[PDB]
Amino acid sequence: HWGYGKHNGPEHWHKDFPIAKGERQSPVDIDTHTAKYDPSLKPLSVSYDQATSLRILNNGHAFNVEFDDSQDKAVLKGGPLDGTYRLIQFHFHWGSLDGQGSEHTVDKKKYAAELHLVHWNTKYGDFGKAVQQPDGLAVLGIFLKVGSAKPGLQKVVDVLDSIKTKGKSADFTNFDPRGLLPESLDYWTYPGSLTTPPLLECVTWIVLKEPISVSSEQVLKFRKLNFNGEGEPEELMVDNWRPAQPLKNRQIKASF
């Protein structure tokens, strides 16, 4: 149904998902001069040592690297969060050119891509119940710029040929998401939403200030994926990002 084309893209989503014009939609532009340092924010705790990846899936709008979230293994806590959030999957948004691709922007600057590590609040028991709550998810967003290759990303890049089209999946065990993190965990945080339909307003966004560097060859491989299914007209999976939405009555806080 919805997608990123001219006839079914972000400006059309509100027809099927009225919440698209809601009060706490994502992504947003992060104005670095307006974001206020909050000394009460506790350091972020990213515990991915026991992460258990399972599979990688082309879902028609991105590719998701899925994790076993039936136990407290890979969790995010601390920072602005109260409680424990379990990693369920990560995916990226990217562009057709290096000058665009990220969903959040920083002083209107667009990065080549953006990584979203999606976590759900264990007090709600499962992801489906968590997305119906204002504090149901915590998404760790990390910007990607083109320059040096990210070694930890190569295993993901190399399996993309096996999931070129919509609906294809492939085994993807023993992938360590710690290899996708930048050095610093300094971050900005604000209350927002999922950036793809259903656009539910259930996300505490934690966006890292330090981008990771990936190579041109790495991002070029993302751009070879397809939005379409096998045996259908080829539609390159590029520009799968929603543009910045009105900040409205929200404050972005900085951990630094």
Q: Which is nearer to Zn ion, 38 or 127 (CB)?
A: 127
Of 71-79, 116-124, 229-237, 242-250, the segment contacting Zn ion by CB under 5 A is 116-124
CB of 137 to Zn ion, least distance (A): 11
CA separation for the pair 229, 114 (Å, rounded): 24
Q: Which two tokens stand for residue 19?
A: 């919440």
How many distinct helices (H) and strands (E) make up the chain?
4, 15
CB of 183 to Zn ion, least distance (A): 23
Q: Is 12 within any annotated ligand binding site?
A: no
242 binds Zn ion (CB under 5 A): no
CA separation for the pair 252, 178 (Å, rounded): 26
Among 116, 150, 221, 242, binds Zn ion (CB under 5 A): 116
Contacts of 5 (CB under 8 A, 6+ apart): 235
User: Amino acid letter at 228?
Assistant: N
Contacts with Zn ion by CB under 5 A: the residue count is 1
Q: Is 91 within any annotated ligand binding site?
A: yes
Q: Is 61 a catalytic residue?
A: yes
* b/e code 109-134 from CB counts within 10 Å (16+ = b): ebbbbbbbbbbbbbebeebeebbeee
Q: Which is nearer to Zn ion, 1 or 33 (CB)?
A: 1
24 binds Zn ion (CB under 5 A): no
Q: Which is nearer to Zn ion, 116 or 119 (CB)?
A: 116
Contacts of 206 (CB under 8 A, 6+ apart): 44, 76, 79, 80, 81, 138, 139, 140, 141, 187, 188, 189
Of 6-14, 109-117, 121-129, 248-256, the segment contacting Zn ion by CB under 5 A is 109-117
104 binds Zn ion (CB under 5 A): no
Q: Is 119 within any annotated ligand binding site?
A: no
Q: Which is nearer to Zn ion, 104 or 116 (CB)?
A: 116
CB of 3 to Zn ion, least distance (A): 14
CA separation for the pair 98, 220 (Å, rounded): 10
Q: Is 173 within any annotated ligand binding site?
A: no
Of 3-11, 114-122, 176-184, 205-213, the segment contacting Zn ion by CB under 5 A is 114-122
Instruction: Enter the DSSP assignment of 211.
Output: P
Q: How far apart are the first and last CA of the chain?
A: 41
Site residues, Zn ion (CB under 5 A): 116
Per the annotation, binding residues for Zn(2+) are 91, 93, 116
Per the annotation, binding residues are 91, 93, 116, 195-196
- Tell me the catalytic residues: 61
